[PDB]
Amino acid sequence: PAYHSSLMDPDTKLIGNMALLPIRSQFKGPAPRETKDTDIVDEAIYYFKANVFFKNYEIKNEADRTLIYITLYISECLKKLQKCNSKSQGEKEMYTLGITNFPIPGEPGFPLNAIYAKPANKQEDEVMRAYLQQLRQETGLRLCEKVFDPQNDKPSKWWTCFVKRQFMNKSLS
Amino acid sequence: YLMKILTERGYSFVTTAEREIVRDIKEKLCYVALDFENEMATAASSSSLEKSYELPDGQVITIGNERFRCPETLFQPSFIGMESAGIHETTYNSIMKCDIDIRKDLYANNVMSGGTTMYPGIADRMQKEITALAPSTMKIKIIAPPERKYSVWIGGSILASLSTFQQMWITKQEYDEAGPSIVHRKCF
Amino acid sequence: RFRKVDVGEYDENKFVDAGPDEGEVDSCLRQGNMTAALQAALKNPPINTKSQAVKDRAGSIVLKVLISFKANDIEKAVQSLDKNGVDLLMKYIYKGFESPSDNSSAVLLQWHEKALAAGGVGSIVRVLTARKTV
Amino acid sequence: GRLPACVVDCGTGYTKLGYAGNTEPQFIIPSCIAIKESAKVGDQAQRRVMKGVDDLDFFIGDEAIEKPTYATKWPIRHGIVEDWDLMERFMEQVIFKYLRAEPEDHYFLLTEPPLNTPENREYTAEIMFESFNVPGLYIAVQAVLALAASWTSRQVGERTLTGTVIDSGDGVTHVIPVAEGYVIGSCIKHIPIAGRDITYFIQQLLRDREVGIPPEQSLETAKAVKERYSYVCPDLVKEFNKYDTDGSKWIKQYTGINAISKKEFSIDVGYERFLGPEIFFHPEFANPDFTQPISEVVDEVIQNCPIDVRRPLYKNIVLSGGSTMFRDFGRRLQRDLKRTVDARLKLSEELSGGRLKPKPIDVQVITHHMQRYAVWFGGSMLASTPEFYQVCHTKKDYEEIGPSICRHNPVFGV
Amino acid sequence: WXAXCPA
Amino acid sequence: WXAXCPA
Amino acid sequence: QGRKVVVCDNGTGFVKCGYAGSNFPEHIFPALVGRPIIRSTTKVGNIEIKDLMVGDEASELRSMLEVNYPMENGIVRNWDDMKHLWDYTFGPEKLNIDTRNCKILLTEPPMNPTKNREKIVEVMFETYQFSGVYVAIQAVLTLYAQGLLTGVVVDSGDGVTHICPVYEGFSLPHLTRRLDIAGRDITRYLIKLLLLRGYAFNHSADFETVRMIKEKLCYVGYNIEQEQKLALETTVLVESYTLPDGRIIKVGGERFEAPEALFQPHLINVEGVGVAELLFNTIQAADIDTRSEFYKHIVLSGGSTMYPGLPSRLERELKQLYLERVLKGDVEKLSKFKIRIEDPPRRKHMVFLGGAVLADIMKDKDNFWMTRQEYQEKGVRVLEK
Ligand SMILES: Nc1ncnc2c1ncn2[C@@H]1O[C@H](COP(=O)(O)OP(=O)(O)O)[C@@H](O)[C@H]1O
Ligand SMILES: Nc1ncnc2c1ncn2[C@@H]1O[C@H](COP(=O)(O)OP(=O)(O)O)[C@@H](O)[C@H]1O
Ligand SMILES: [Mg+2]
Ligand SMILES: [Mg+2]
């Protein structure tokens, strides 16, 4: 709520309802490359340590939806990564989690589906599919580089303690 | 009336504390207008008449036409809805009811007192109105001492200091024997 | 200091809206014909009279007549009466019932029980809803 | 040689105790009360009905914690009390064992939260007048006692009645302004979050972020808050990344002692060093119903009272109460209030132009001793005043009118 | 309102 | 006043 | 012109719209605005929602909305919010009217700053480009629904109360006064009190929740002493209401003292004198020939006056004032004094009736409105009064 989204210029495009904010990633998708390290995922990770505590979130701008979705997916990523053993194993788990079929907005199985829009045309469906897949892959690559530490090669308790603190009291599952 | 108009401007005051505040505001930032219509027109060009006052809380209030509007109620009682006449009209009627010969003396001498007549320019407006109403063949003079607030007290002190007045007092013995009605006959 | 005073001085009508004797009762008592004593006691009720004297006289006489009875002929005394007489009776017993002291409880309770056995709840209803000061 | 009266400040947390005309509350004990209850099943038609003298077979105070065969059952819960029989038992135990004061020849002053319903006060006064037969009684809100105690901070001789107090509590912290002795009735708000639910959140987070503690000795572990272990934080995310970056020097360690097997157990200290105390300005973390800060509540309550009193009130905010002991609390509150009030002044000036410049509103927070207890000294001065002996409700007043004499409240009137 | 009361 | 005007 | 006119009362709490010559309003909706919000406590999205939603839909779906009020006391706070509300009501699903060839009637509250009127008229002339508009006072809009040329109005509603006595038709501006009491405030107070009872409430949506509870349970008394003694000596007046979530709450004493603030503004930190006392003072301050006529004819207008028992309390208070401040307790002369409060059954909406009847006969002649042409000139405004 108080710590809402930022870095959203009006020139940013959209896909039905979401804001197609560029994300820098070595992978491929319908997104451009931004030279600056700052992006949606960086801010989401930066603010996730506090967004969970709050119990409300006003969607001041469209990027708020992106922040909500990324944090919601990060919750599941942390839940699945708590049982990790090796950095390679964690990367493998995150990759196989990114290449999945999760409830797309506008379809059943998706929380707070009322806020999000329901795509109608065919092309926007796969556009959103690819965008969300790219976001998931980037989030997985970003978590693996800080969740683990050079010593003990295990998920830090500090980063998995929030496993039970499901955002808005519920997760994708 | 000042509270009512301050409401029309956008500032609200109801309780007695704000009554004292508005009383101070009027005491500090009010004056009379020689010509009402000309002042209203100049207010239409509101770039040199508005003034600001600092409230106890720090809020600043800008007052424009209200400075010269409320005092005009004295000359125009119809603003409040009273079916009467202004001070100029009442004084003219009172002087006319007097004998013809003493009218000249009354015109030549016009003493004013009280805390409601300290507005700058009031004397000039009264003089202009009286001369306009009165025939334009004699001279009308307005005397406005700068200490009219305490004129009554000064007069009372001087009267008490008078030797001849030391016997006009009313004592307990005569009051008790006669009764409360004595004061009625004492100089009306 | 306003609402303090009542304003209930309205005009709409807030519903603005033959005594007994003693010698005959005494003669019946001394003669022993208790039924005649009770009948005389119930006769000439103060249905239309505004004075505490007749009210207290009727209450005292009916109480004294009732007290002297025994718990064998009460049923016979009640039976030899009309329904309106039973209602007037029950009203008299209720009126004298408030009278405390002098052990004027048990006999009144038995009389009330017999009246209920005969008069029924209708007597209770009539006594309760009778603005008539009897 | 008149006997002094008795001063008591009952409440949900540590109950203050002592006599009037003294500079230190001699006895400060929790509200924990023992009882010889066990496992009956018929517990809703005979709660206890202890046979013989077993009814009084219960301890009290700090000695009641270390009795592992009874039940530690707190009677109070943020002012409101469900069953007051335990309260009466505690009151008799204290007056006799600890105070040793005869009620029939002493005067008792009691303190209750402002939100206490009239029924509770009426019935407790009835209980007192019936059992203890106290000649006089008086109940008042604790804000004025705190204001009186605040004079000791500086310039006692300089009379200063205006101000406002935001007191803490085990289950309640309230806001009450004072305007030259007379408080405002409608400008009072009750905050449910207090210094207890904070510890609940601390222990809830700790039970997952760390292991190595026993279930029994949890609260003693959760009481790192009462230690130097919590600092407030002008910014939240900044310190979050500070910890997540270094995470070496800012982390502290715990070296508590087990109370059963006498085996040392240790756990590190993490984000809870600031989150707990920060919950005061972000109550939404614990209580979802009350999503409302404190400083803005202070400004709102100070902005709902006459103009002539708004100015001096901001100048006098008293730091009194246990939950307010957190460091840098005053700085945060002062800065936030100054920011909001300056913004309001600028907005007011923007609409009406002018080359003037109003003198800036001054907001100052005062730090002093007496923060842990600011009600006891107020009660002592209450008792020392002769007028107290005259205002106190008398026996005959309760004799036939009833216990309604104690029903007077500062936020009621017809 | 602007001065006095909120509105 | 008593009749006419308040005072 | 199109011979089409729509009458609206863009008040504070509720907004009513309708066409002229209509017995009852066609559409009634409240002034609710709120951006979408997700509460982590409970509940998630079920049906469709939009970024900005207002109207009746808010009254049903406030659970997931940050409901806020744009206007209070009849004064402008949020220009954009009112613009959005006007766009919504003027859209093709609420009114569906052609701005360029339509006329409207506005009823602004008496004794309000001219800035609000200037802003609203300028907005209507520029953003929507209405050919002509008008502004009227509640006095005509009320007294004109039953054929009364003289009376005193005690119009009370969301915001502030107001009074506008009229004798033989001609206005009496110097005998109108304003007080800071209304339904919203009675609400803030039902709230401090149920809080005491021990319930925690917010200021986002539960403010609308307590509306129904106040509508059903809340009532005003005849004598404060008798009712208070009854409350403290008995518990039959206890009643409850089923909350949307199924929760049950008890309210037996707080439901009675909330309306008492109207006659005792002291309860809510206001140096008021009371509605009845204010009316008596206003009547007395006037001339003499008008006092009796004002007392004989009096109206109780506004939806906030629909409380059960208000007429009895008012008449009793007025009689007490007449007894104490005039007759000094002489009850004998008090019998002949007569009062007949005018309480039409349609007290929920009477201003709309007045506007409709006005437009019925004041439509053919074009010399009544502020026509669009005059706007383009300077030295303008204050066209009529
Ligand atoms: N130095 C401290 N640091 C942190 N918390 C403290 C400190 N002292 C007291 N507290 C907290 O404040 C609470 C007691 O405040 P208090 O008002 O005296 O209880 P009560 O409401 O019964 O008077 C305790 O629960 C405690 O957790
Ligand atoms: N039955 C009622 N009981 C109490 N208050 C009511 C009732 N009906 C309306 N109100 C109050 O009156 C207020 C608005 O009344 P209303 O006069 O119709 O507004 P408007 O002046 O814009 O037409 C509402 O905010 C509401 O609080
Ligand atoms: Mg406390
Ligand atoms: Mg209306």
Describe this structure in words.
- This is part of a larger assembly, with one copy of chain A (173 residues), one copy of chain B (188 residues), one copy of chain C (134 residues), one copy of chain D (414 residues), two copies of chain E (7 residues) and one copy of chain G (385 residues).
- With 188 residues, chain B is mostly helical.
- Chain B has a domain at 1-87: Actin, Chain A, domain 4 (Alpha-Beta Complex), CATH 3.90.640.10.
- Chain B has eleven helices and two strands; from the N terminus they run αααββαααααααα.
- Chain B is extended and about 65 Å long.
- Chain C has helices spanning 23-31, 34-42, 52-67, 74-79, 83-97, 106-118, 121-128.
- In chain C, helix 2 (34-42) packs antiparallel against helix 3 (52-67), helix 3 (52-67) packs across helix 5 and helix 5 packs across helix 7 (121-128).
- Chain C is elongated.
- Chains in contact: A-D, A-G, B-D, B-E, B-G, C-G, D-G, E-G.
- The interface between B and D is medium-sized, with 14 and 15 residues.
- Strand 3 of chain A pairs antiparallel with strand 4 of chain G, so a sheet runs across the interface.
- The complex binds adenosine-5'-diphosphate (2 copies) and magnesium ion (MG) (2 copies).
- One magnesium ion binds next to loops of chain D.
- It is classed as structural protein.
- The entry lists the keywords Arp2/3, actin, actin regulator, Structural protein.
- Single-particle Cryo-EM structure of Arp2/3 complex at branched-actin junction.
Strand order of the largest sheet of chain G: 3-2-1-9
Percent of residues in β-strands of chain E? under 5%
- Work out the largest interface and the residue count of each chain: D-G, 20 and 21 residues
Structural class of chain G: alpha+beta
Heteromolecules bound? adenosine-5'-diphosphate, magnesium ion
Total strands of chain E: 0
Rg measurement of chain G, Å: 23 Å
Question: For the terminal residues of chain E, how far apart are their CA atoms?
Answer: 4 Å
Largest sheet of chain G: 4 strands, mixed
- Given the C-alpha coordinates, what overall shape of chain G results? flat
Let me know the largest β-sheet of chain E: none
Please indicate the percent range of residues of chain G in DSSP E strands (runs of 2 or more): 5-15%
What proportion of the residues of chain E is helical, as a percent range?
under 10%
- At the first level of CATH, the class of the domain at 183-263 in chain G is Alpha Beta
Features:
part of a larger assembly, 7 chains, A: 173 residues, mainly alpha, two-stranded antiparallel sheet, 5 helices, 3 strands, globular, B: 188 residues, Actin, Chain A, domain 4, 11 helices, 48% helix, 4% strand, binds adenosine-5'-diphosphate, binds magnesium ion, nucleotide-binding (chain D), nucleus (chain D), actin-binding (chain D), actin binding (chain D)
